[PDB]
């Protein structure tokens, strides 16, 4: 494939787009790179994640503002104004669903599929992504549609977890990131704070015990995520 | 989708930080062909200021890179950055042609003789957006837009010194942006500083004329004119 399109120019464009803070361009470049069907370098894997996290993140942020407005607005009872806002919230939802769908397709049909059992970190990374984006779908879903995304997020986090227990140090940033977000899933989506705290604590303690397993490359990222785990732990606890 | 709904959407869009939506909403309001209220006019200005501003920011970062990497000298990496810059440029110029068009065909054309605040506001906008064009243009292209920016700034200047008070925020803002045109675009620091100081000192002279409604707007701009003079003189 790469014989047809220059793969390295595409990644360069993505780096470029990141610096101009043009994240649609960035995701577009990384989608294309993925589609060449080669496996993704650790950097490329980050570029991909950052691009889509900012593209979906912008919609999330706008949705939360518009949702909050709908609650106050409804309170008034002004028909026309409420419908304005609900319509607008829906426009943003549909952009959000479309970005999640783009990511999930990429994950299932390119990223997850391609990597080996031996490549263990890639598998957890992408499986966590799949968890996150079903979680993003879950945040704006209702009724049946919601249960299905929640279950899907669950399934994807649950498998990401099993693979990390068995094959990753409790201090690995990815295994730590996974524990973070999975706990967030339990608190925010499942409204199950008992599980949330348990998972966030279990992960934090296990990390602390093995504090020897940190290298010069890990200590920055492992400890920063261990703090977040704790920050959520403290909070939810109160 | 009547006029009051459009403005409601512009407001929502702003909360959402969705500035293209907000620009599109106020563009539809402008095209209803009636004058804009002060609220509406600020909504319009804010929308397009963020829309174009996102591009201006991008372009600078990309432009900065072109210079630094032209050194490394790879002739296909140089070519790509140049392309990316040009992609951004054409978006930015398109936003500016769009605003300018609203200005010449609707907003400016629709002022009555006695709507001086409005004219100074719209001529300063016209001034601003030809300036945005000048930041990315070169050669005769630059000369042409720089001339246009000047021509608009200058007419706003004269209407404002005859019909508005030194403490008026639209007049003060004109001075600040116009002083910037002199500094950044025409590269005339002396003529910049004179314009910034005169507007500041004139405002101080008549500080008593600040009304309760806009003293916050006027005072912040006065703060900026100073920050500018400090920076520009200090070098």
């Amino acid at each position: 494939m790469g014989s047809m399109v220059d793969r390295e120019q595409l990644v360069q464009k993505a780096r470029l787009a990141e610096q101009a803070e043009r994240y649609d361009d960035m995701a577009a470049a990384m989608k294309n790179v993925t589609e060449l069907n080669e496996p993704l370098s650790n950097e490329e894997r980050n570029l991909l994640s950052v691009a889509y996290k900012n593209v979906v993140g912008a919609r999330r942020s706008s949705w939360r503002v518009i949702s909050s407005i709908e609650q106050k607005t409804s309170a008034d009872g002004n028909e026309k104004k409420i419908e304005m806002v609900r319509a607008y919230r829906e426009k943003i939802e549909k952009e959000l669903e479309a970005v999640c769908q783009d990511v999930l397709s990429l994950l299932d049909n390119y990223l997850i599929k391609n990597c080996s059992e031996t490549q263990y970190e890639s598998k957890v990374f992408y499986l966590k992504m799949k968890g996150d984006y079903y979680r993003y779908l879950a945040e704006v879903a209702t009724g049946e549609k919601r249960a299905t995304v929640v279950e899907s997020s669950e399934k994807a986090y649950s498998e990401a977890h099993e693979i990390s227990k068995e094959h990753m140090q409790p201090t690995h940033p990815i295994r730590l990131g996974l524990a973070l977000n999975y706990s967030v899933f339990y608190y925010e989506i499942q409204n199950a704070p008992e599980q949330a705290c348990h998972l966030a604590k279990t992960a934090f303690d296990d990390a602390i015990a093995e504090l020897d397993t940190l290298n010069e490359d890990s200590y920055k990222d492992s400890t920063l995520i261990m703090q977040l785990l704790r920050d959520n732990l403290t909070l939810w606890t109160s | 989708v009547d006029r009051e709904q459009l403005v409601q959407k512009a407001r929502l869009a702003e909360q959402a930080e969705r500035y293209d939506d907000m620009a599109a909403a106020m563009k539809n309001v402008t095209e209803l062909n009636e004058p804009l209220s002060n609220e509406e006019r600020n909504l319009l200005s804010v929308a397009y200021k963020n829309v174009v501003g996102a591009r201006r920011s991008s372009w600078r970062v990309i432009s900065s890179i072109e210079q630094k990497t032209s050194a490394d000298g790879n002739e296909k990496k140089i070519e790509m950055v140049r392309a990316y810059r040009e992609k951004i440029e054409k978006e930015l110029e398109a936003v500016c042609q769009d605003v300018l068009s609203l200005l010449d065909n609707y907003l400016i054309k629709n002022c009555s003789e006695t709507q001086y605040e409005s004219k100074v506001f719209y001529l300063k906008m016209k001034g601003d957006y030809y300036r945005y064009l000048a930041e990315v243009a070169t050669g005769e292209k630059r000369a042409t837009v720089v001339e246009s920016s000047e021509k608009a700034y200058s007419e706003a200047h004269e209407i404002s010194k005859e019909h508005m008070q030194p403490t008026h925020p639209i007049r003060l803002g004109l001075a600040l942006n116009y002083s910037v045109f002199y500094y950044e675009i025409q590269n005339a620091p002396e003529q910049a500083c004179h314009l910034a100081k005169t507007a500041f000192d004139d405002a101080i002279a008549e500080l008593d004329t600040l009304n309760e409604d806009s003293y916050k707007d006027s005072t912040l701009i006065m703060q900026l004119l100073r920050d500018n003079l400090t920076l520009w003189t200090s070098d």
Binding site: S49, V50, G177, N181, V184, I225, N232 | N177, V180, D227
Partner: peptide, 11 residues
Amino acid sequence: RQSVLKVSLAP
């Protein structure tokens, strides 16, 4: 220059 003008993992 001036002219008038509960977390999850982070990128």
